[PDB]
């Protein structure tokens, strides 16, 4: 027991670890010195709490790495308790903690302001009349949404309506004639500039005599 291990820092800090970091990514290196000779000065590294199944420490190297995927939107930061135990009886311990905070990156989809949208209009509505407004909210809270009609929205309905790529306001583009169509189901995509499979909503437009 001549002395116990002392880490080089009380709290280690890794700030802005990318949440989309891959498995095995280097997080931070800890180090506890023990100036006893032989096995009394040889320390074994271990996490006691706080990693929540996302981090693993090398017992010998003291390197911490990730061990599955991270998520800013599920947990923004981690505080792990680490021990260093010397290699001979009586296995004296030393202690630190490790603070990891995550960098929010654009890896999530988008929510809309309702389940769907509806508009009831009359024939021969003037051009550029506002019909309804689609609005959506980047889950990631990084980007603004851009709005467009999806690929499968019909030529006929692309001729009659236009959505604003910024405001998401749908306006009258051409002349709505009842006999040509009294009801339209539009599909609006909200793009966040991100990866995800496209977030869409329905707009149901009804035309009256």
Q: Which residues bind Na ion (CB under 5 A)?
A: 108, 110, 138-140, 192, 194
State which residue, 36 or 192, has the beta carbon closest to Na ion. Answer: 192
CB of 194 to Ca ion, least distance (A): 9
Please choose which of Na ion, Ca ion, none residue 104 contacts, taking the beta carbon within 5 to 8 angstroms, the exact cut-off set by kind.
Answer: Ca ion
Distance separating alpha carbons of residues 167 and 163, to the nearest angstrom: 8
CB of 110 to Ca ion, least distance (A): 12
In sequence order, what DSSP letters do the residues of 94-152 get, joined into one string? EEEEEEEEEEP-S---EEESSS-EEEEEETTPPTT-EEEE--EEETTSS---EEEE-TT
Answer yes or no: are the C-beta atoms of 3 and 36 closer than 8 Å.
yes
Binding mask 119-158 for Ca ion (x = CB under 5 A): ---------------------x------------------
Q: CB-wise, 34 or 138, nearer to Na ion? A: 138
**Partner touching 138 among Ca ion, Na ion, none, CB below 5 to 8 Å by kind:** Na ion
Give the CB-side neighbour count of residue 113, counting CA atoms within 13 A.
Answer: 10
């Amino acid at each position: 027991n001549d002395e116990a291990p002392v880490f080089t820092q009380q709290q280690y800090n890794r700030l802005g670890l990318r949440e989309t970091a891959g498995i095995g990514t280097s997080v931070i290196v800890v180090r506890a010195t023990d100036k006893d000779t032989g096995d009394g000065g040889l320390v074994n590294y271990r996490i006691l709490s706080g990693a929540e199944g996302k981090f693993e420490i090398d017992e010998s190297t003291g390197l911490i790495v990730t061990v599955d995927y991270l998520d800013y939107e599920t947990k923004t930061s981690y505080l792990m308790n680490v021990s260093a135990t010397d290699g001979a009886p009586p296995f004296n311990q030393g202690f630190c903690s490790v603070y990891v905070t995550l960098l929010n990156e654009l890896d999530e989809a988008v929510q809309f302001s309702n389940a769907s949208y509806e508009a009831v209009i009359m024939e021969n509505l003037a051009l550029g009349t506002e019909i309804v407004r689609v609005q959506a909210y980047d889950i990631d809270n990084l980007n603004q949404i851009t709005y467009r009609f999806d690929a499968y929205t019909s030529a006929q309905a692309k001729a009659l309506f236009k959505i604003d790529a910024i405001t998401g306001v749908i306006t009258v583009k051409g002349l709505v004639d009842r006999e040509k169509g009294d009801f339209y189901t539009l599909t609006v995509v909200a793009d966040d500039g991100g990866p995800k499979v496209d977030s869409t909503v329905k707009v149901y437009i009804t035309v009256l005599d």
